[PDB]
Symmetry: D6
Subunit: 166 residues, 12 copies
């Protein structure tokens, strides 16, 4: 039971990297160029896009992926110099668990579970409240849900091993 867990953790990590690297840069390419508002005022589209989408999903996901692979690099650099290893193993396991839970919680608090098609804006230089329209909302919602599911799997597996050793 603890034997297969490692194998699947390695497989889940690689699957996630491949999905982000190959297709996600091209779902988000037209995000601001196809964002449009009903107005004749210069500068309102810029302000409303910035308030609706402060950090794009794809940037957050690349950052998370890189930061959850840092403990391994540290351990690798140490072992290369070596040429108390078990204590290092323990500590890096602890750190990886913490980092992945933090990133999942932050995703829920920043973005939620859906991307709507309409947005209501009241930022200067817009006069009163205006209505704006988003590009490709259904595809972006599907990507969000898939990523939450994969990261949950990873959290479960790492807790499994943490509680297995104790």
């Amino acid at each position: 039971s603890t034997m297969i867990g490692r194998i699947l953790l390695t497989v889940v990590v690689i699957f996630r990297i491949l999905i982000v690297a190959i297709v996600g840069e091209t779902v988000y390419d037209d995000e601001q160029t196809m964002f449009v508002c009903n107005t004749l005022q210069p500068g309102c589209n810029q302000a409303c896009y910035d308030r609706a989408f402060p950090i794009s999903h794809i940037r957050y996901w690349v950052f998370q992926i890189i930061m959850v692979c840092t403990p391994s690099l540290c351990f690798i650099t140490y072992s290369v110099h070596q040429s108390g290893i078990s204590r290092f193993y323990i500590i890096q396991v602890v750190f990886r668990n913490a980092l992945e839970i933090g990133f999942l919680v932050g995703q829920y608090f920043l973005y939620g579970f859906s991307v709507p098609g309409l947005y209501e804006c009241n930022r200067y230089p817009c006069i009163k409240e205006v209505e704006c329209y988003v590009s490709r909302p259904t595809e972006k919602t599907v990507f969000l849900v898939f990523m939450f599911a994969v990261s949950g799997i990873c959290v479960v597996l790492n807790l499994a091993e943490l509680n297995h050793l104790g």
Copy 2:
């Protein structure tokens, strides 16, 4: 008869990967930029494109290709650690069969066998029903039919071997 089946399965898989990777990203590049509707209302083109094309074909095909190669990676990671293999072989064969049938069925239910040149839309902010026009419909239909045929071949071959061992 069971000897050549493996050889051709390997060849079919590689052929499919090459076709998707080299040309498909560039048939679909202008999908929304050349989609147009007869209207003066801001935001109708966005809503109508999202309702006509919820998930693009090329995204679905990349995802399917990656997911049908996961059992092999698991088996490979196990065997590398090894340095009951036959039971693992049996189980992974079962899983691959199931995954490919699911993906083919889903394709039929999501997209059908053709891409029409006209689309009729009734989503807010469009006033009543409007008519919209698609880019490159004949080429997209040809790609759809070819992909269904290749995946059918793969399903047949894997069932062949499953029933051969029994």
Copy 3:
């Protein structure tokens, strides 16, 4: 006489791959963006481009190149497993000959020997018949003629060897 034929066949194949891979993606890049019709009707440019150019030349050529290299991959996979070879050699030679003749015949029936500068269109939503204008017609005609010549050479050489063994 049969000695040099193999050497030149290998050279012809590589030459064709290089020409298609390095320059052809950029002759065809502006095909629809620089296609224009004399009209004020929304959707006519889309319909007329699709009827004039159903499958682009570059897509057809990539597909042909990949499909004529499949018998070699099958033979290679077999020989790797081996670690009646001559019968396999015979059969794959037969198949390659057939495939290349089919592709050349199809090219002649789909495209002909020239690309004209004007096109006459009568598809809905266009009112009666309209006149449209093509991008880079002379360069596209030159590419067509060159490709027919190379494929003819390959057909001749493979028949040479087929009749040599008998």
Copy 4:
């Protein structure tokens, strides 16, 4: 305590390179194309963009990264020829410390800690003072703060080792 410092310095350097190389070229891609001013005068957008953003962040960061890796290349070229090493080690450590402090100080004096959404311009050919509007200000502020933090960590670590040897 001095053992782990080297390991983490190597890890920090690699992390910074990866973040700059993979995502930063695409946050800044639309910087001038989505910069807009309220005016009908030809040439004002150009003058105001140049005065607001003299050197782009991404250019400065690439330059800094390359220049802080020069002492290592010199030491490497010397040691390759060798096939007083400790004196060379001392001097290159001194130089790296100096270079990183200079670059951090310059960042603070050139850019500060935020990117505002509005800009006020009074350069010819603009008539009196005009108001202009920036693209993606919140994301650019986040990137600035992250980079200052990483470079601070590196400064601390290198001073640690400098004072350790003495």
Copy 5:
């Protein structure tokens, strides 16, 4: 004297390949998008660009480079199978000489020694004669002259060796 000639021929060939591959694709990128004519007639820009620039320089140069390297590939494939070589050497030298002289002569007859800034057009659908304007003419003339000079050097060197053996 015959010793250094081979060394410099190899160097000239590599220099030419590098210049064409690294920069030439980006001098010619805006050739049709920045070509403009004084007219209100739909389709005249297309017809006039095609008549002024039938085959672009960069396409001709890539083709020439690939075709002058074919005799070497044939000789290489033969020698690999070998594992009358001197006769093959003689014949391939003859062929290379002929091919390079043909390509230089064709360049002179197709393009000349300059690219003008204005062009005068009388092709349907243009009414009578119209005036059109070219992008980046001085840079294109400089590239033309440089390429003629390099190819001349290569012709001289290969004739040198041909007459040396006799």
Copy 6:
């Protein structure tokens, strides 16, 4: 003193190549698309851009970099065949010195030390004199000054070694 000079020459050369290759292609990408003149005359923007910027900086720098590495390739090809070397060393040193001084002098005579924001034009089809406006002038001036400084360093170092041997 002559020992370190070689090490630093190698380091300077590599630094220059990296700066040109990684960032310079993207400072100059919008050079003509963001060049604008105050006029209603077709063709004036084209003529004025060509007269203001005959050869772009980035093209000149790529060419210089490639040409200053040619003596090394010749020497390398000779030594490979070898498997009076010192005479070849002497001559190639002489040639490299000459080439780098020529390129620096030409830079000063072609471009100077600054790029202005305004340009005054009197070329046909422009009526009398018109005023035009440049993109990103401050960044381009900074790049110019940096490149002059690096090439000066290289000139000094090579003269050092030339006078050292004598």
Copy 7:
């Protein structure tokens, strides 16, 4: 009672003529120029204006005014020639009564009692049903109601005198 009726009839007639002649030509001046529909189809505004407003109010009112003054002109021309008058008086009274009742009934059946601000159209070349927008609807409704009231007064008065003589 019959004495004042004639005086007021003369006054009502003159009041109506003055109102139509002085102001009504300028309420209706922008009727088609400010009529607008949500569409990109050429010719839909024309078809929809013609179907919504077949005969303009002001034309109908001018025609009615002229036709109800014809019996008087006939009687006047007769009496001028005279230089059974009572029989002519009787007959012309009968005719005037009939004409004014017909015109009032026709007004009710053609136009009703209000002019709405929105109009729904389904005439060729419009695709399906479209929405259009009217100019100055409230003012036009007020004018309609006033005119119905005045004509009713006139009908009552003329019947009064008809029944008075008997």
Copy 8:
């Protein structure tokens, strides 16, 4: 019976003059400004308007009205000089009859009984056949029918008197 005929002829003539003079100049005011065709070709609207409407209705009606009042002016000028009258009366009656029949016949042959909403055009510079759209067709048809009816009445009355005297 012949007594009233003169009275009504005078009344019919005056009624016709009033209708043409007061309202008809403003039904036809936007005839060419609101005529539109589906095309991008300069000059097609002009050619198609001229072919659809060679002489406007209002011009023809003004001309007819003036020419049918010429015999009276001649008779008046004669009688003023007088200060065989019956012979002049006879001849002028004959001439008036002839003129009014000619004008009615010409109206039928030039215009017919309706004005359609669509027009089909094939005149240079239009490419093949194009579709054009007319302004206010229903109102123009109503005016046509009314004018034919009035002129018929006048013809009948004048023949009445001609046959009465004999």
Copy 9:
């Protein structure tokens, strides 16, 4: 005191007629053509102009002027037929007083004492509330105040005479 009152009443009436007739038609000529709102929605300008200005000032003033002159016309028609006059004088005086007070009260309730430069609109098809801008507001306010003053003078004078006779 009662002698001059009649003289001034006649003078006030004539002054008012002249001011309305000569200049007011040209202050109001561009009322809707220069009314503008900040929106991209078709039909909002029409709806907002109709809600802000239901009946134009100039129409109301022409109507009032005509209706306050009706009692005089009735009295005149009676006296012409005459060829109890004092009772008719009494009654018409009463009616004129009433009519002028009603019109002044209505002006105050319909329009007030000022015309603002901004207007806030929330009528369909406008999305939420929009801001619109008026033409020539200061001149229109001046005209309003002047007209209220003149009508007040007339009211005072007519009451004077009414109370004088008693």
Copy 10:
């Protein structure tokens, strides 16, 4: 025979005045606003309209009409002062004859007998020769022919009387 000639001359003169005064100002109203040329050059429409139509027909006709009525005014002013008349009669007859022949000859030499629909122009600032398009050509030709006919009648009649007295 000489009796009726005077009567008809008076009638012809009045007919001509009425036709010019009532309708001709409105055939020519859009002469320059609907004149269009195929070009993008500023100022070409102005130059080409001025060269095609130097003096408009309607101006020439008004001038002619006024100048042919001058002898009568002189005679009238003389006779009014009188309160050798026959000599004045003779001289004024001579002058009127001469003036009308001159004006008819000038019409033929200035305008001819038709107005074409196309015009070919080669005036600065137009580049080479351009094609332009005229408004309402058929109606203008009809007006020309009618006016020539009327003036011919007048010439004949005045010569009649001149030769009658002798």
Copy 11:
């Protein structure tokens, strides 16, 4: 001396009326349509025109002309009823003097002696201060100066007569 003064006063009054009535309505016709500001903000042209030109010159002049003719109408109405005249003459002279001095003083305080070509504006919705441009400034200044001169003459003459009687 007092005899001619009356004659010239009558002549001056008539001259002024003719100049205002015949030409001034057409100098001012394009006042707002040719007023333009350098801005992209909706509503700024309206606000700036209203602040620069609160009451147009031509309106003020018509009003003044009508108000200075009121004393004469009162005197005329009195004298007509008459069918102490000298006292009425005295009083009306006093009133006319006062009215004309008031109007001249007001002109100086409202408009001054010139109309400039540029105007500087800072009214909402304009962002900060903007520059605007006026139509026909020189002609408007000439009209202003002429009108001041004429009114001064009238003031002088009326004071002359006032002091003459005493």
Copy 12:
């Protein structure tokens, strides 16, 4: 000889009034709307039209006509009061002569003898010198020459009579 001079003076005056009143208002109607300059700068068309045409011809001619009829009005008002006349006759003759010579001299100094088709402008806000284009130049030159000729005739005639009396 002095008898006819008066008759012709009266005729010349009336002819001039008729020509100015009937046609000149419509040659000049599009003077600024069809004036165009080659520029993208806001406000340059306004400044250049004002500098090229400070006072329009038609305004100057109306003013001159009114001012040369003032002496007659004075004489008429005097003679009406009369109900030394010869002295008044003498003085008014003197004044008329002077006024007409002044107006002719001023015309020559203000306008000359031609109106050119091109105009060269250097007024702010135009950048350096720009080229502008005039409407209807040939017709305006013809009108100028005709008016100079008529006024010369009048000058000659009035001097004739002045010298006749002496």
